[PDB]
Amino acid sequence: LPAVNPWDVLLCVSGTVIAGENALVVALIASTPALRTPMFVLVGSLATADLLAGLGLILHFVFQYLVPSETVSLLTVGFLVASFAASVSSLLAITVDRYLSLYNPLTYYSRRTLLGVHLLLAATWTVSLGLGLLPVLGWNCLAERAACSVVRPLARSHVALLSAAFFMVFGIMLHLYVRICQVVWRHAADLEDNWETLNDNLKVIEKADNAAQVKDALTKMRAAALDAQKATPPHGFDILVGQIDDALKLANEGKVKEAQAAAEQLKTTRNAYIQKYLAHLAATRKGVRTLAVVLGTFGACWLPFAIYCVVGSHEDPAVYTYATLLPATLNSMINPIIYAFRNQEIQRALWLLLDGC
Ligand SMILES: CC(=O)N1CCc2nc(N3CCC(Oc4ccc(F)cc4F)CC3)c(N[C@@H]3CCOC3)nc2C1
Numbered sequence: 001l002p003a004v005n006p007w008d009v010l011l012c013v014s015g016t017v018i019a020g021e022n023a024l025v026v027a028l029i030a031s032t033p034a035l036r037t038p039m040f041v042l043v044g045s046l047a048t049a050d051l052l053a054g055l056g057l058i059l060h061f062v063f064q065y066l067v068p069s070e071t072v073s074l075l076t077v078g079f080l081v082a083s084f085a086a087s088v089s090s091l092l093a094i095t096v097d098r099y100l101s102l103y104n105p106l107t108y109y110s111r112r113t114l115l116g117v118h119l120l121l122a123a124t125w126t127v128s129l130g131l132g133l134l135p136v137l138g139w140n141c142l143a144e145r146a147a148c149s150v151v152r153p154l155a156r157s158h159v160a161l162l163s164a165a166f167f168m169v170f171g172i173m174l175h176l177y178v179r180i181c182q183v184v185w186r187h188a189a190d191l192e193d194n195w196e197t198l199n200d201n202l203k204v205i206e207k208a209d210n211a212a213q214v215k216d217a218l219t220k221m222r223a224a225a226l227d228a229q230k231a232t233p234p235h236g237f238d239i240l241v242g243q244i245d246d247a248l249k250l251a252n253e254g255k256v257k258e259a260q261a262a263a264e265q266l267k268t269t270r271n272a273y274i275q276k277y278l279a280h281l282a283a284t285r286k287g288v289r290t291l292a293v294v295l296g297t298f299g300a301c302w303l304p305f306a307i308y309c310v311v312g313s314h315e316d317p318a319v320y321t322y323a324t325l326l327p328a329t330l331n332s333m334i335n336p337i338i339y340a341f342r343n344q345e346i347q348r349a350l351w352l353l354l355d356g357c
Helices: 005-029 038-064 072-105 109-139 156-206 211-231 238-252 256-311 318-342 344-356
Strands: none
Touching: 005 038, 005 238, 005 318, 005 344, 038 072, 038 109, 038 156, 038 318, 072 109, 072 318, 109 156, 156 211, 156 256, 211 238, 211 256, 211 318, 238 256, 256 318, 318 344
16 A cells, blocks of 8 residues: 555556546537537647546656656646646646636627637637647756656656645636626626516506506516527526517506406516526536536645655655545545536536447
């Protein structure tokens, strides 16, 4: 157990597992058009990052025993560096994709969103690969004037910069998650206000002998409906808007009795629409909850190492290194599992192949 070679073969098999599952997920995102939305494209990018993690550690074992050259091991640590950086970057990317999709989904138009998503993938993979290559350029720890970090051949200075960057990145991701929550809080609160106003309007319509009270209540009802529509395009209540338009038409041309009757008929469509929006908000809560779980798991798995690699002592037992990498490494293993157990849309494809086979 405390032995490093048994640990090494253990992590070798685990990284084989990790690379396989990540490759499967990337294939599903690339092959399924239903999974081609910004969110799932970014999720596939993270799958690729964890794939790189598994592949890099497999290669690091493969060479570690029976390697041709150290140069290659330096490149493979570049691999692991790139996997970590891509994972963290794409995680922030999914956070912002969620925040943008929910903040004002109408502004979540295809042009800027597809532009942003492809830009995010480019700026993530470019940066991550550049970092992974930096130790190749001469940013490693193999000099008589440079101290080696726990993960050779990475220097303590550069791993320290990586750790501090990761900490600040994680803090920013947390703030963005809280902004996301705020957005959803408001989307629900404004809807509750509109329900109060709409029920008050329907109530006050019945108790009025003047044709102008009906017009006022119907206009306020229309405004409330249009606000609720503005909240989230992401199954149509434009029908309710149209029924309110019919009621307004009748009300204007001196049709009080039948205008009130139409405002009553609005009750059926209002029941349907109010039943509708609740499912939407439940789905939003589910997606945001999955985001939160993923963030928590990533932090818990990596922060141990993120701290140790800097506070490491260069004379401590080897076990500490494992105890910090084992969470961090198996984070790549656990990430594929989460979405499957939770995200139903991609879980569908997971079970689809069995129908195929
Ligand atoms: C000798 C040996 O056992 N090797 C060779 C070197 C090695 N390097 C790893 N990475 C390198 C980059 C580093 O990134 C940072 C992470 C946190 C920081 F705060 C600052 C960093 F810079 C994380 C650790 C690593 N981790 C993998 C990643 C996926 O599962 C475990 N496994 C190994 C295996």
